[PDB]
Amino acid sequence: YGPNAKSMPTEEGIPPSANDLLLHVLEGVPPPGSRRLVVSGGDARAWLSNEK
């Protein structure tokens, strides 16, 4: 490819498997750096780390 190779083709592959922090979230260990959350009305807990 030369210096003006504008039309570089699109490269793609396998989608990601899963996000691995869900294991800790499932067990009861909150992820690092997160914040506590308030839940009302049921038996549940929640956290917020990275706008998710």
Binding site: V38, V39, S40, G41, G42, D43, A44
Partner: protein
């Protein structure tokens, strides 16, 4: 006010069911922890069913949820 009224009385707040225990062996009509089972159907708040209220200090009376859709009833009237 008396959750176990005209009976044995209050024993303790069980956090597993989130209920008071009457001294006569029944679960109370009241609640004692927020992690209980409430029949919740009605709410408050603005920009619901979207990204919530975007918490910035806006120059105008416009207020927009985090998905981009706005709420004119959350906004003022002029």
């Amino acid at each position: 006010d008396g959750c176990c009224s005209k009976m044995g009385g209050i024993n303790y707040c069980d956090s597993s069911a989130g209920r008071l225990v009457c001294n006569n062996g029944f679960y109370s009509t009241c609640y004692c922890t927020r992690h209980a089972v409430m029949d919740l159907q009605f709410l408050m708040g603005c920009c619901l069913w979207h990204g919530g209220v975007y918490p910035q200090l806006n120059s105008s009376g416009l207020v927009v949820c985090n998905d981009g859709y706005v709420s004119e009833e959350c906004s003022l009237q002029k």
